[PDB]
Structure 1
Amino acid sequence: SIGPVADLTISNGAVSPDGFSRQAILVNDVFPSPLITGNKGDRFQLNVIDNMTNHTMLKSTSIHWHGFFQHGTNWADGPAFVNQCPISTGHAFLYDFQVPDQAGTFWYHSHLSTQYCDGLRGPIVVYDPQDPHKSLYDVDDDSTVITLADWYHLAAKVGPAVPTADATLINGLGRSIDTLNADLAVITVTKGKRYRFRLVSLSCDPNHTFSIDGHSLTVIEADSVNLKPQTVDSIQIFAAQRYSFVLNADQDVDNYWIRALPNSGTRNFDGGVNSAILRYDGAAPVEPTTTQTPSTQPLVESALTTLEGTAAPGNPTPGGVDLALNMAFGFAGGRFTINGASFTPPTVPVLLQILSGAQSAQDLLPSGSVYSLPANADIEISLPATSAAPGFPHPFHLHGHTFAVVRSAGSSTYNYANPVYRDVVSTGSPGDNVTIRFRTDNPGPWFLHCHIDFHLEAGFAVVMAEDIPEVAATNPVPQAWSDLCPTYDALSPDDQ
Structure 2
Amino acid sequence: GIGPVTDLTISDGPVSPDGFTRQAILVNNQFPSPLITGNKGDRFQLNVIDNMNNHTMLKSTSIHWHGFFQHGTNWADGPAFVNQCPISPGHSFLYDFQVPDQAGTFWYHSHLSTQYCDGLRGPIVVYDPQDPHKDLYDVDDDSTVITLADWYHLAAKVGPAVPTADATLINGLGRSISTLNADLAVISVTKGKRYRFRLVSLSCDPNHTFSIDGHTMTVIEADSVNLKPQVVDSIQIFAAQRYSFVLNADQDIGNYWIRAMPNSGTRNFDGGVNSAILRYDGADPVEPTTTQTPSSQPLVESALTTLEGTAAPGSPTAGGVDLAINMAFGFAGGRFTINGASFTPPTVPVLLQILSGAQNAQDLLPTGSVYSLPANADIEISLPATAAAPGFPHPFHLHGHTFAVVRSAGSSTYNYANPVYRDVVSTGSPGDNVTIRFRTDNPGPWFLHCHIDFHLEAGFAVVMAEDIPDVAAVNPVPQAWSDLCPTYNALDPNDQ
TM-score normalised by the chain length of structure 1? 1.00
d(CA) in 2 for partners of 1:172, 1:104 = 21
Please list the CA deviations of residues 323-373 of structure 1 after superposition, one character each: whole Å capped at 9, or x if unmatched: 000000001211000000000100000000101100111100000000000
d(CA) in 1 for partners of 2:200, 2:129 = 21
d(CA) in 2 for partners of 1:88, 1:124 = 24
Please list the CA deviations of residues 195-245 of structure 1 after superposition, one character each: whole Å capped at 9, or x if unmatched: 000000000000000000000000000010000000000000000000100
d(CA) in 2 for partners of 1:101, 1:303 = 25
Deviation at 1:188, TM superposition (A): 0.2
Quote the RMSD (CA, aligned, Å): 0.4
Q: Secondary structure at the match of 2:229?
A: strand
d(CA) in 2 for partners of 1:433, 1:384 = 4
Deviation at 1:107, TM superposition (A): 0.3
d(CA) in 2 for partners of 1:231, 1:390 = 33
1:157 aligned partner: 157
Unaligned runs of 5+ in 1: none
Deviation at 1:101, TM superposition (A): 1.1
TM-score normalised by the chain length of structure 2? 1.00
d(CA) in 1 for partners of 2:223, 2:102 = 12
Deviation at 1:135, TM superposition (A): 0.3
State yes or no: 1:118 paired with 2:118. Answer: yes
Q: Secondary structure at the match of 2:176?
A: coil
d(CA) in 1 for partners of 2:55, 2:351 = 27
- How many residue pairs get aligned? The number is 496
d(CA) in 2 for partners of 1:472, 1:146 = 39
1:9 aligned partner: 9
Please list the CA deviations of residues 71-126 of structure 1 after superposition, one character each: whole Å capped at 9, or x if unmatched: 00000000000000000000000000000111000000000000000000000000
Superposition pairs of residues 55-70 of structure 1, within 5 angstroms: 55-70=55-70
d(CA) in 2 for partners of 1:246, 1:51 = 39
Unaligned runs of 5+ in 2: none
Superposition pairs of residues 53-452 of structure 1, within 5 angstroms: 53-452=53-452
Please list the CA deviations of residues 391-445 of structure 1 after superposition, one character each: whole Å capped at 9, or x if unmatched: 0100000000000000000000000000000000000011100000000000000
Q: Secondary structure at the match of 1:463?
A: strand
Q: Secondary structure at the match of 1:33?
A: coil
d(CA) in 2 for partners of 1:477, 1:309 = 36
d(CA) in 2 for partners of 1:226, 1:392 = 28
d(CA) in 1 for partners of 2:108, 2:313 = 28
Please list the CA deviations of residues 158-188 of structure 1 after superposition, one character each: whole Å capped at 9, or x if unmatched: 0000000000000000000000000000000
Please list the CA deviations of residues 429-462 of structure 1 after superposition, one character each: whole Å capped at 9, or x if unmatched: 1110000000000000000000000000000000
Query: How many percent of aligned residue pairs carry the same amino acid?
Result: 94
d(CA) in 1 for partners of 2:318, 2:471 = 29
Q: Secondary structure at the match of 2:23?
A: strand
Please list the CA deviations of residues 56-76 of structure 1 after superposition, one character each: whole Å capped at 9, or x if unmatched: 000000000000000000000
Q: Secondary structure at the match of 2:454?
A: helix
d(CA) in 2 for partners of 1:339, 1:185 = 43
Please list the CA deviations of residues 126-147 of structure 1 after superposition, one character each: whole Å capped at 9, or x if unmatched: 0000000010000000000000
d(CA) in 1 for partners of 2:279, 2:431 = 41
Q: Secondary structure at the match of 1:383?
A: strand
Please list the CA deviations of residues 223-269 of structure 1 after superposition, one character each: whole Å capped at 9, or x if unmatched: 10000000000000000000100000000000000000000110100
d(CA) in 2 for partners of 1:391, 1:286 = 38
Q: Secondary structure at the match of 1:239?
A: coil
Q: Which runs of 4+ in 1 moved over 6 A?
A: none
d(CA) in 2 for partners of 1:133, 1:457 = 38
Q: Secondary structure at the match of 2:495?
A: coil
Q: Secondary structure at the match of 2:493?
A: coil
Q: Secondary structure at the match of 1:482?
A: helix
d(CA) in 2 for partners of 1:335, 1:255 = 46
